[PDB]
Each structure stands twice: as structure tokens, then as C-alpha cells.
Design a protein around this nucleic acid. Structure first.
Ligand SMILES: Nc1ncnc2c1ncn2[C@@H]1O[C@H](COP(=O)(O)OP(=O)(O)OP(=O)(O)O)[C@@H](O)[C@H]1O
Ligand SMILES: [Mg+2]
Lengths: 485, 50, 152, 543, 49
DNA sequence: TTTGAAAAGCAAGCATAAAAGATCTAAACATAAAATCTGTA
DNA sequence: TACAGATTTTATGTTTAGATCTTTTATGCTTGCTTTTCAAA
């Protein structure tokens, strides 16, 4: 038969369509799912990425410092206690509950929740509480937002079903199955804002299963914002999530110090056998070298990060960047390759902090050609003349022509007018646009300095500055020629 | 086109290219029992060729 | 039937059939098929979350399409159908019954009647009345009071 | 309630529509015999009409085929006056494939969809006559590599006047790229409803130069040379030959109504003739007497209603200065139809004149102005005495005559629709008959008709409250409250009527129901989307 | 005339003819309407003088 | 034969309806691999 | 049981029909001044 179109790349998973409510003949016929081989969880790729080294690589003194500062809990004790007490009471009373946690990035939400469920699993290993199943659902790690329905049911039953069948199965399992035939499930919903669809059915279902009497379900919902339910969710879901919500504040600088010095307990103020032939250092031709990080360097890093964000990732990356700068300076002076006392002091931390804060924008427009800077200068002149923050391109063409023909006594303009309008030939006729007109316009568009409107008339098309006018004039004043006229 | 269709097209052209407030100054030709005045027309012609 | 755990709104008639069916399985995509199935016989359907039957982005008249069919067949002669539809007012002819938000005295009554199964009440009663008064109002949500006492 | 439903089916509970004439004293078998006479005459008309329809469709197919089959350009055909219902069938070329691709304006929203539908149709038809491909013009390129024979594509563009000419121009320029392949022949058919210049002003000049290389104009409309309308009118005259007469006013009504329709003339002519035949056989009691079998079933009512004839008036006045006499004058033939047949045959054959209207010729022959009709040709001056006929007057012709004096054809087929609405609303005595609420019916008009007179005398923008005040002043306050208190079984009505503003409230309720009735009818409109304070009148009477 | 595109509306798709908010315009050139007016011997050029 | 005087005409300014279209969505239309259902055997 | 075919389910792509919002342009209202026919003398 003749097809109107073809779908030759369809890849369909092997997932059944029959839900759990039809799996048994009656409610009384459902067995103990805890005593089932495939229920409640009762790494095939990790050998793929291995090879032989055939080399002994050099690990300098700063390498152990840089590995100790990677993201891969002295300051989270009240939040740990609250989350642990709520989850513990819900587990050992066979209750269903929702624990809401919100915060800015890198303040330790995921780490605290994972340590809470680790200590809960340790409690259930010694029979202080009934045994439970732990499930992680990250909303940013799903292809489709409905795949969470597929994931949780697969973690509960071992079945592979499609998403509507999975959510029917989960609805039947939480609602109708008796408690004595079930197990407690703790579900971490990480990145909750990613699980928000147009119709909020996933959020309603996940928080409404926690209001079922038989469910034995605990949902730990981790969100960006305290008032995410009030901003983006319905009143029923906001009622079901609750009024009691746990805020993870940004870290103060004493806590960022505590985190960094907890990362630097075993190598800060310690000795190394350095082997100055290669620089490969071994922790206790060969010298005993003390390594230290300055406490005031950690102080200024922690103070800057705690004022700006309180992010632990940012503080660890700042200290790691400082160690990288010190290691680059160290390997420059010896030529150690990769195959006394060395200190990560204040200035490395300051150079690491300022390299994220210095702007390349003014440096970028400084090193442009004459024609691009002439474009920017004419656009600034038109912006101050007619007061508009949006200028027609034909006006910019006429302004460039006017600035060339008015400042015709300038020596640079005398030297460059023939280049700008004839490419210095006297065989090319006089042009209506300058040489490299479309080039510098497209260059300022790729850089994001300019915005242009989608019109096909070139003269009446408008152009806007996407950067600050003060930055543009500061760039234009650095040039010797354009600051004169 | 028929007789009615051609005159409907002619009237549509007249409607599109003449202003409606000059209508009673042109086509009005019936006598009156009640006192009344028709539209005087355009006081001066425009030079735009509509 | 909770109406959120439904694929499309227009399948609700089919969802009414699968509750009341042993047997043959028919295709129901309109009010007419469910009517002619329920004509030769009474039937009571509680529809929780009636707001999910609204069709989004389909103009004001055609958005309420399925709900007019349900509430019209719910009044039709010589068919035997009682339709109870609960919904929520903050998230959105039949007889209308309103569940007003609870007052502090009603919340006190609910709290002591729920706590009656325990050997003792661990709260002071001015604490319970203070919690009830601080939780009641224009949003008398009992979930908020339960959360406040649990947090205490 | 099914009245609040959008659609519902009904299975109701459970021999001719012809009624008994002669003030209810007709025989029952006369009614049945009238029904069978109408059926045989109507069948004898429509067998000829459907044969004529088959003939015009076959001749149009043959002429289009002869144009289509008679280097690197299109074979372009412009069918002028085309309504795009013509079936086009192609010839079965040996070792070549011929495909017809039809394209409407709805199937042409852009060039991409036009090409995709064309290539799907081509691939489907070629595989039907003889692996998936991509529906683009490389299928035309690789056509002989898959199918082993060359290709002839005939594009039939229906409703060009409704198509986007930018899209059509770009599709033509896209098809021009297929001329570089040796095995491709492309023909284009343009069904044009207005004229060629209106479409040459809409294409590019390069497209006009492209289409001019091999093109043929062919003016085929329904109203072309009267070759088909005269056949249908001749079929009707052969049907009613020897039994019925056509008045000159009926024929001029046919001419006048046929002049107002251009694209669809023949269906209007058949509709008008059919409805006149229906009206005669439904109305006239002497329809039984159109055949000489039924001469033995005449009674006193027949003699009462045949004696009131103006031809009988003049005949007995001339005799001064009954059943046997009425029977005796059925043998005549009234050979005006045969004379018209002979004149048309003479003009078509001997004088080689085909551009004439037999309906106009019959109209002039009925009046007596056949020579003044024939004066337009300047070729019958030598044969006018041969071709002229004096109109013979036949007794009792009024009882066997298709005519429009009552205005029945005008009211039934082409009514002054909005004028009838306006006349009913303004007058209402000619609609509502004159005869509990008897005291109020003599004083108070129906609310729509009463409001329409105030509407007619108001200006183009009416203040709605002043309109209400005028409507309130038109009503009587005493009799309205008396009529609303005449029923004592309505407690809420009796409570409202004793309130002193009951007249104003009743007037407002009636006024507002009439105002939104007028809004649904289209008489008034509101000058806002949120206000209801000024109305504009959209309808003026007499237009 | 609306079918032959000799008369146009503001709305082109899903246009209801019966609304009082629907307006009407001619789309023929001046030469086409001049040919039409002279085919019925109507003097349209008096009206633009 | 005149004659003031009210109906009608024109302009500036501004609030506002309407047109055009940018952007998007639902639904009809279309295909398709896996699961599921008959259905004799 | 048991396998082959039919139907359904879930899933995704193609095209049409329609809603909503936004920006730009006609359209009419208000008010002050000026032309022009007209009911009366
Ligand atoms: N209290 C802490 N003690 C030690 N290390 C910490 C602490 N808080 C955060 N970190 C470090 O910072 C990293 C980021 O923490 P985590 O993943 O928990 O952040 P999060 O609050 O969930 O943020 P995001 O919203 O970006 O997901 C941790 O992996 C860990 O290395
Ligand atoms: Mg996290």
C-alpha cells in the first residue's frame, strides 16, 4: 500500500499496558508484596570505560588539594533533625506524609536529604523502624515528565509499564492495597519545578497519594523556591503540600570556612616528599615540603561567597581555582610536566575571585576595528540626538556618512575615507555602505552587543543596544580618534 | 456577469471610492412633502485621485 | 471517580461504563451511547475534581462541552442517573451545596473528637483554640490546622 | 430537554398530496388521474432533460480531449466560463502513462502542499496502474527509472479565481523545472469564471510569457449560444404540446429571471418550468381534460367554472351581435409550437444562424412581433413572408395555460425576502387575523410590529432609553394592568401588578424581549462590546 | 461576487456573512470596472469628475 | 427680489475600534511497533 | 496449552482550523469656525 508519509526510525520500548488492578482477581487475592521476588528492588556498563595507563602520571603537591575540594555536614544539623524526625515518625507509624524543602542552589538540600535517608536505612537495618524502599526521582533527568510514573512503579513492583498504566497501578497500589501487605516508600522528588506541566496532574497525583490512608508513602519534595506552590500550583495542591515548609538558607562565612577546612583536614599544614626531579609528591632529589592554605585566604573567599550567594559549590570552586593558579605558577618555574613551603595565599584567591567579575565587554569593543567602533559611535550619537533607544539602520548609514564628511580635516579620516568607500582602489566605484558594513553588523549581532529586528527592508530596520550605554561610551572613549571628534 | 452583478460591482466601486457623507448630494432626486435640505456636496475638490 | 486520573475528559462516559460493567465492552465516545446503555434499566456516580472536565484553549462555549453533556443527561427523563459532582471553588440546573470553611469551634470539636482515641490529650486547650483561631478565617483549611499541631 | 441539545433523532408514531378541487366537490378518481397525468408529463420532460445533460457533458469531454491531444513548454488550456464540475478523462497511451491531477484552492494553501498532493496522486495512480519515495519533483525526474515508461501530467486547476495567484505563480515556475527531463509532458487546465485579462493582471509577466508559448482559449459556459437552453425549452414545448398553452407574460418572466443568473441558467429554467407544471396540476380542475379519455366526467361545477372565461365572453358577445361545445374544441392542436420548431430549424439549417434564443423567439411569436425580432439579423428579408405566422386565438385557452398573474412564481422561487419581512412587521394586519385578551388585542399591537414603527421613524442611531420611553408612551397603562389582573391564579403576577411601577416593568420586559428579537433578526446592532446604551439600525424599508 | 473574488472582506477564512461587524470592499482595478461600466453603457467617470 | 439663519461642511486633537499578523494550540488526519485479544486447534 | 492473525494501545508525525494578543492604522466624537440654500417678507 502507498503511504502518505513514513516513520522509519520508530523505537518503541517493551512495556506492557495492563495495570496492577487487573493483576489479581480481587482485593483479598493480593498477596504480601513484601514477600514477592520482584517487588521493592529484590550497573552493567561500568567496565566499558577502562584501559591500561602505560604511563606513571605526575601528581604535584596541589593535585591532592584540588581533588579534596571537589563536590564529589557541620552546618546542617537543625534541618537534618527536622527532616529526620518527620520521616522517622512517618515510617514507624505507617503514615503517609509530605516534607517540603526549598532553597537556592548549592546550599546542601540534596546532600542533607541523602544523609537523612542513609541514617534512616541504618536505623531500619538494626530493626528500630520497619524496613522501607528509597526512590529518587529527579525531574531534570527525565525525558518526558510522565516518566516519573514509569520510574517509581518500576522501583516498586519490578514491572515495566507505560506511563498511564503505571500511574493507574500506583493509584491502585497506594489507595486500595492494605497496609499489612505493603512496605513504606520514601520518594525524593528533586527539582520539583521541572515536574510542573500545564495541567498539574503529576503534582496533584504525587501529593494526593500522600493523603491516602493506606498509602504508606513519604514524599520529600525539594524545590527552588519557598512559594513555588503559591506561584505555579493550584490551591488543592498547595493545600496538600502543606503550610510547614523547610527553608535551606545560604551559608554564612563561618560555615563556608567549616566546609572548606573539613575538605582540608588531612593535607593543610602537612609535609610531603616532593621528588623535585619530576615534582610527583607523596604524602607522609627529594625534599620535605610543607603545604598550607592561608586562613585569611579562606576567610576572604568565604566572605565574598557568603555575601553573594552562600553557595558551597561556588566557595569550593573558588578555592580550587586558587589552587590551580598556584599550581600553574609552580609548574611554570620548574617545568614539571604531566607524564620549601608552597602556599595558596591571598593573591591567588583574589585573582580567582576577580577573574569571574572582570567584564570582557569593554575590552571586546576596545579591540574592534575602526568600522565597528564607528558604527557604535554613530549609534550612540543618534541615541543622544533623537533620544530613542532604537535607531533605524539607514539613520546609522547617514550618520556614518555625516561623521566622515564633517570631520574631513582629521588626518585619520583623510587617510581612511578612500579605504572606507572605495577599498583604496580607484577602480571600485563609490559605495553606499562602508567596506565591511555587513561584516561588523553581523559581528556585533553574534557578540550579543546588538539586537536587530526581523524586517527585510534594510533602511527602516531598527537596531538596539543590548549592552549598557555607559559601557559603550567607556569603550568609545578609549580610542584615540573617536574621542577627538 | 449579469445585469445585476455588473451594477452591484459598479455600486461597490462607488461605495469604496466615495465618502458616505457625500451620498445624499448625488443620488437624491425625490421630491419632498416635509421640509428638508439635501447635502450641499463638497465645498472644494481634493487633489489626491483616490 | 476522581477525574484527574483520566486521559481525556471526553472518556469519562467510558469511565462510567467500566465501573458498571461485569460482559460485552462497547465503544462510548458521546453522551448518546451511555444514555442508550442506561435507558433499559438506578445509577449514582460521584465525580471528584469536576474541574478536570474543562477543555483548555477551546473558547468559552466549547470548554464546558463534556460537563453540559453530563449535567443534561443527569436530568433527562426515563433514564435513571444521579450525578454528584464535587469541585473546589478556588480552582474553578443542578442543586448546589456549599461546604463552608470550618470555624474555630468546629475545629475544636474535630480536634477533640479525633484525639478521643488516645489515652490523654497532650495539648493544653488554649493552645488548641489558639491554633484553631489562627488557622480559621476566609481559608478554613483543616489540613493547615493539622500541620500546625503536628509541627508543634 | 432535546430542545437544549445540538442534534437529536426522532422515530415517530405511524396517499397522494393532491387535494380535492372544485370547492371540495371533485371526484376522488379525478384527483388520482391528475396525479398520474402530472407524473407522466413530468417524466416525459425529465427524460429529455437528463438526455440533454448527458449530451452536454459528453460534448464537453470530447472537445476538451481534442484540445488536450490536438516542445519544452506547457500545453495550456483556458476553459472560460467553467464551474469546475467537468469530468476529465485521459487517453490510454501505449508505453506511456497519463495522469490527471486535480487541485482545488482549499488543497492549495502553499506551494509545498500543492506539490506534495500532486506527487502523492502521481505515485498512487502510477502504482495503481502498474517501496516508498519522497513526494517531490525528483519522483518526476526518476519516473522512467521506476516505472519504465514516460509520463504525461494534466493539471486541472479548479476555481482559479479563488486561488492565491502568488502560490499559483510559484507552483507554475516550480513545474517549469521539470522541462529538463526528456520523458515529461505537462498540460495545464485553468477553469476561469470571469475572463482572461483578470488573471493575466494577477500573474507575473515572465509567467505570461511562459504560458503564451502553447495555449488555447476555449469559451464553454452553460449560457453559450443558447444551444442547450433552447433544447430544454423545446423539450418542455414538446411535452406540453397539444394540451397546454404558455402565456407571453410567463415566457417573459422566464427571460427576465434567466437574465439574472449567469453561471447556472439551465437548472433555473428547469426549476421554473417544473414549478409551473406543479402549480397547474395542483390548482386546475380541468387538468383531467388534457387528454380526450376523460370527456365523460364533466359536471355542473365544471360548466359553472368554464363559463367564466373572457374568451367565452367575447365569443358569445360576437354570437349575440354548452358541454358539447366544450368537448368539441379539444381536437385542435395550436400549431404555434410547430411553427417555432420550423422557424428554428430553418434558421439553423438554411440560413446557418445558430446565435438565437428560442425563448425570446417564442415570446415575440406570442406577442406578434416575430418580424421585429427577426430584423436583427438582416438575412430574412426575402423569407419573412414564409416565416411569419399570425397568432391564432383559441377558445377556452385560459383553462389550459401556464401563467403568472397571481404572483405565485414570484413568491415561491424569487421572493422579495427582506421586503416581505419589513412589510409584515410594519403592517401586521395582513398577517394577524382579525377577530380573554380580546380587549387588549383591539388596542395593543404585537410587540415586534409596534416596535418596528418606532424603529422606522427613529434616526440611524437610537438612544435605547428614549426608545423605551416612546414604546411606553405607545402602550395603555389601564388595559395592560387589567389584562394582567384578569388571571387570579398567578400569585406573583398579582403581587407585581399592585405595585405602582407595574406598567413600566411590564413595558420594559416586553421591550427588551423585542429588542433582542430584533438583534437576532439583524435589524439593530449595539455600538460597543460592553455597553448597551445606543443602537444602530441596519435595515431600511424598501431596499 | 464574493465567490469570484471581485468583492472582498476583511476576513478571508471562517468569515460569517451575516455579522454586522463584517465590512466589504471591491477588488477590481479601475480599468476593469471601466470596461464593466461601458459594457452596460453606465457613465461612472462622471462620478469621479 | 431680498435676507438673516439654520442646515451643512472642514479642521485639530484625541480616544478608541479594527485590521493585520505573530505566535500558538487543538483537532483532524496519518502511521506504527508492542501488547493484547480472539479463536479455532 | 498454543500459535497465527486481528484489534487495541501507546506513541509520534502532518496538516488544517481557529484563538489570543499586540501593534499600527482608520474612524468617529467634540468643538469652533465658515459656506450655502431656504422659509418668509
Ligand atoms: N553542609 C555541607 N557540608 C559539606 N559540603 C557541602 C555542604 N553543603 C553543600 N556541600 C557541597 O556542595 C555540593 C552541592 O550540594 P547539594 O547537591 O546538596 O546542593 P542543593 O542544595 O541540592 O543544590 P541545587 O539546588 O543546585 O541542586 C555538595 O555535593 C557538597 O560537595
Ligand atoms: Mg540538588
Amino acid at each position: 500500500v502507498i503511504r502518505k508519509f513514513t516513520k522509519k526510525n520508530v523505537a518503541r520500548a517493551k512495556k506492557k499496558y495492563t495495570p496492577f488492578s487487573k493483576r489479581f482477581k480481587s482485593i483479598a487475592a493480593i498477596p504480601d508484596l513484601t514477600s514477592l521476588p520482584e517487588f521493592y528492588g529484590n550497573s552493567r556498563f561500568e567496565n566499558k570505560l577502562k584501559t591500561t595507563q602505560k604511563h606513571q602520571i605526575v601528581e604535584t603537591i596541589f593535585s591532592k588539594v584540588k581533588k579534596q575540594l571537589n563536590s564529589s555536614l557541620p552546618a546542617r544539623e537543625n534541618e537534618f533533625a527536622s527532616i529526620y524526625l518527620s520521616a522517622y515518625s512517618a515510617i514507624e507509624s505507617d503514615s503517609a506524609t509530605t516534607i517540603y524543602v526549598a532553597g537556592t542552589p548549592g546550599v546542601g538540600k540534596t546532600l542533607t536529604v541523602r544523609e537523612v535517608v542513609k541514617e534512616l536505612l541504618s536505623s531500619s537495618a538494626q530493626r528500630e523502624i520497619p524496613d522501607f524502599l528509597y526512590v529518587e526521582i529527579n525531574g531534570l533527568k527525565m525525558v518526558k515528565p510522565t516518566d516519573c510514573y514509569e520510574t517509581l512503579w518500576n522501583k516498586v513492583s519490578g514491572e515495566r509499564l507505560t506511563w498511564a498504566a503505571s500511574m493507574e497501578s500506583l493509584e491502585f497500589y497506594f489507595k486500595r492495597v492494605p497496609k499489612n501487605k505493603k512496605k513504606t516508600i520514601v520518594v525524593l522528588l528533586d527539582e520539583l519545578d521541572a515536574m510542573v506541566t500545564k495541567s498539574q496532574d503529576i503534582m496533584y497525583n504525587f501529593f494526593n497519594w500522600t493523603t491516602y490512608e493506606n498509602a504508606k508513602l513519604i514524599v520529600i519534595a525539594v524545590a527552588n523556591t519557598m512559594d513555588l506552590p503559591e506561584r505555579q500550583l493550584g490551591n488543592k495542591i498547595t493545600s496538600r503540600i502543606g503550610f510547614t515548609r523547610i527553608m535551606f538558607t545560604g551559608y554564612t562565612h563561618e560555615e563556608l570556612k567549616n566546609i572548606i577546612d573539613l575538605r582540608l583536614k588531612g593535607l593543610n599544614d602537612s609535609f610531603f616528599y616532593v621528588d623535585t626531579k619530576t615534582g610527583n609528591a607523596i604524602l607522609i632529589d627529594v625534599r620535605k615540603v610543607r603545604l598550607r592554605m592561608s586562613a585569611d585566604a579562606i576567610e576572604i573567599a568565604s566572605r565574598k561567597v557568603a555575601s553573594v550567594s552562600g553557595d558551597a559549590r561556588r566557595a569550593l570552586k573558588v578555592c580550587k581555582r586558587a589552587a590551580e593558579i598556584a599550581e600553574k605558577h609552580y609548574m611554570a618555574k620548574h617545568g614539571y610536566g604531566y607524564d620549601g613551603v608552597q602556599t595558596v595565599h591571598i593573591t591567588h584567591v583574589m585573582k580567582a575571585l576577580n577573574e569571574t567579575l572582570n567584564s570582557h565587554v569593554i575590552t571586546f569593543m576596545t579591540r574592534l576595528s575602526f568600522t565597528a567602533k564607528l558604527f557604535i559611535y554613530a549609534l550612540l550619537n543618534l541615541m543622544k540626538k533623537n533620544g530613542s533607544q532604537e535607531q533605524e539602520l539607514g539613520d546609522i548609514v547617514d550618520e556614518i556618512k555625516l561623521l566622515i564628511e564633517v570631520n574631513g580635516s582629521n588626518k585619520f579620516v583623510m587617510e581612511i575615507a578612500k579605504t572606507l568607500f572605495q577599498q583604496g582602489s580607484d577602480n571600485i566605484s563609490e559605495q553606499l555602505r562602508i567596506i565591511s558594513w555587513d561584516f561588523v553588523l553581523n559581528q556585533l549581532l553574534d557578540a550579543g552587543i546588538l539586537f536587530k529586528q526581523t524586517m527585510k527592508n534594510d533602511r527602516i530596520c531598527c537596531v538596539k543596544l543590548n549592552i549598557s550605554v555607559e559601557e559603550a561610551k567607556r569603550a568609545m572613549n578609549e580610542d584615540e580618534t573617536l574621542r577627538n571628534l | 456577469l449579469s445585469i445585476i452583478s455588473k451594477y452591484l460591482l459598479i455600486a461597490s466601486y462607488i461605495c469604496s471610492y466615495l465618502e458616505p457623507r457625500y451620498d445624499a448630494s448625488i443620488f437624491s432626486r425625490k421630491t419632498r412633502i416635509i421640509q428638508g435640505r439635501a447635502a450641499y456636496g463638497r465645498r472644494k475638490k481634493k487633489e489626491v485621485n483616490p | 471517580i476522581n477525574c484527574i486520573s483520566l486521559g481525556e475528559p471526553s472518556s469519562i462516559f467510558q469511565k462510567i461504563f467500566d465501573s458498571f460493567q461485569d460482559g460485552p465492552t462497547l465503544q462510548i465516545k458521546n453522551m448518546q451511547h451511555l444514555q442508550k446503555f442506561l435507558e433499559p434499566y438506578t445509577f449514582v456516580v460521584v465525580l471528584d475534581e469536576m474541574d478536570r472536565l474543562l477543555h483548555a484553549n477551546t473558547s468559552e462555549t466549547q470548554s464546558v462541552r463534556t460537563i453540559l453533556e453530563l449535567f443534561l443527561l443527569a436530568k433527562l427523563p426515563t433514564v435513571s442517573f444521579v450525578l454528584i459532582g464535587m469541585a473546589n471553588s478556588l480552582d474553578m440546573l443542578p442543586q448546589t451545596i456549599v461546604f463552608q470553611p470550618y470555624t474555630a469551634e468546629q475545629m475544636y470539636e474535630i480536634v477533640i473528637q479525633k484525639m478521643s482515641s488516645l489515652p490523654t490529650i497532650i495539648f493544653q486547650p488554649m493552645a488548641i483554640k489558639f491554633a484553631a483561631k489562627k488557622c480559621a478565617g476566609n481559608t478554613g483549611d483543616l489540613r493547615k490546622l493539622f500541620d500546625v499541631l503536628r509541627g508543634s | 430537554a432535546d430542545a437544549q441539545r445540538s442534534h437529536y433523532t426522532v422515530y415517530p408514531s405511524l396517499h397522494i398530496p393532491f387535494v380535492k378541487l372544485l370547492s371540495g366537490k371533485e371526484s376522488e378518481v379525478n384527483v388520482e388521474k391528475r396525479w398520474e397525468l402530472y407524473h407522466q408529463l413530468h417524466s416525459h420532460f425529465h427524460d429529455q432533460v437528463d438526455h440533454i445533460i448527458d449530451n452536454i457533458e459528453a460534448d464537453l469531454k470530447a472537445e476538451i480531449s481534442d484540445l488536450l491531444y490536438s516542445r519544452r513548454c506547457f500545453n495550456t488550456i483556458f476553459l472560460l466560463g467553467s464551474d469546475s464540475t467537468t469530468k476529465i478523462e485521459l487517453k490510454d497511451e501505449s508505453s506511456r502513462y497519463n495522469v490527471l491531477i486535480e487541485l482545488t484552492p482549499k488543497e492549495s494553501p502553499n506551494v509545498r502542499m500543492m506539490l506534495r498532493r500532486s506527487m502523492y496522486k502521481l505515485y498512487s495512480a502510477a502504482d495503481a496502474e502498474e517501496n516508498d519515495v519522497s513526494y517531490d519533483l525528483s519522483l518526476v525526474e526518476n519516473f522512467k527509472r521506476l516505472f519504465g515508461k514516460d509520463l504525461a501530467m494534466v493539471f486541472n486547476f479548479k476555481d482559479v479565481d479563488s486561488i492565491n495567484f502568488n502560490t499559483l505563480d510559484n507552483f507554475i515556475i516550480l513545474l517549469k523545472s521539470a522541462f529538463k527531463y526528456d520523458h515529461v509532458k505537462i498540460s495545464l487546465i485553468f477553469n476561469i469564471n470571469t475572463n482572461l485579462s483578470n488573471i493575466e493582471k494577477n500573474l507575473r509577466q515572465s509567467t505570461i510569457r511562459l504560458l503564451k508559448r502553447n495555449y488555447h482559449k476555449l469559451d464553454v459556459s452553460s449560457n453559450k449560444g443558447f444551444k442547450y437552453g433552447n433544447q430544454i425549452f423545446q423539450s418542455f414545448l414538446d411535452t406540453v404540446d397539444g394540451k397546454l398553452n404558455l402565456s407571453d407574460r410567463f415566457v417573459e418572466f422566464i427571460l427576465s429571471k434567466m437574465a439574472n443568473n449567469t453561471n447556472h441558467n439551465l437548472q433555473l429554467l428547469t426549476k421554473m418550468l417544473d414549478y409551473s407544471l406543479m402549480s397547474y396540476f395542483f390548482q386546475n380542475a380541468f387538468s383531467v381534460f388534457i387528454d380526450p379519455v376523460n370527456v365523460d366526467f364533466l359536471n355542473d361545477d365544471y360548466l359553472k367554472i368554464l363559463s367564466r372565461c373572457p374568451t367565452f365572453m367575447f365569443f358569445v358577445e360576437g354570437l349575440i351581435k354548452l358541454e358539447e361545445f366544450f368537448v368539441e374544441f379539444l381536437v385542435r392542436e395550436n400549431p404555434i409550437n410547430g411553427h417555432a420548431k420550423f422557424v428554428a430549424r430553418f434558421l439553423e439549417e438554411e440560413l446557418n444562424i445558430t446565435n438565437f434564443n428560442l425563448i425570446e423567439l417564442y415570446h415575440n411569436l406570442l406577442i406578434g412581433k416575430l418580424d421585429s425580432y427577426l430584423d436583427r439579423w438582416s438575412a430574412c428579408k426575402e423569407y419573412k413572408d414564409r416565416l411569419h405566422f399570425e397568432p391564432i386565438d383559441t377558445i377556452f385557452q385560459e383553462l389550459f395555460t401556464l401563467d403568472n398573474r397571481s404572483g405565485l412564481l414570484t413568491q415561491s422561487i424569487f421572493p422579495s425576502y427582506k421586503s416581505n419581512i419589513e412589510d409584515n412587521l410594519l403592517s401586521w394586519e395582513q398577517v394577524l387575523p382579525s377577530l380573554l385578551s380580546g380587549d387588549l388585542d383591539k388596542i395593543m399591537a404585537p410587540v415586534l410590529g409596534q416596535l418596528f414603527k418606532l424603529y422606522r421613524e427613529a434616526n440611524m442611531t437610537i438612544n435605547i432609553y428614549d426608545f423605551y420611553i416612546a414604546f411606553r408612551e405607545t402602550l395603555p397603562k389601564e388595559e395592560i394592568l387589567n389584562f394582567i389582573r384578569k388571571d387570579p391564579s398567578n400569585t406573583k403576577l398579582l403581587e407585581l401588578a399592585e405595585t405602582p411601577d407595574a406598567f413600566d416593568k411590564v413595558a420594559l420586559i416586553l421591550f427588551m424581549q423585542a429588542i433582542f428579537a430584533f438583534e437576532n433578526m439583524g435589524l439593530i446592532k449595539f455600538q460597543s462590546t460592553k455597553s448597551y446604551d445606543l443602537v444602530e439600525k441596519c435595515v431600511w424599508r424598501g431596499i | 461576487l464574493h465567490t469570484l473574488k471581485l468583492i472582498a472582506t476583511t476576513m478571508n477564512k471562517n468569515i460569517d456573512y451575516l455579522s454586522p461587524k463584517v465590512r466589504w470592499k471591491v477588488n477590481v482595478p479601475w480599468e476593469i470596472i471601466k470596461e464593466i461600466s461601458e459594457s452596460v453603457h453606465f457613465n461612472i467617470s462622471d462620478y469621479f469628475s
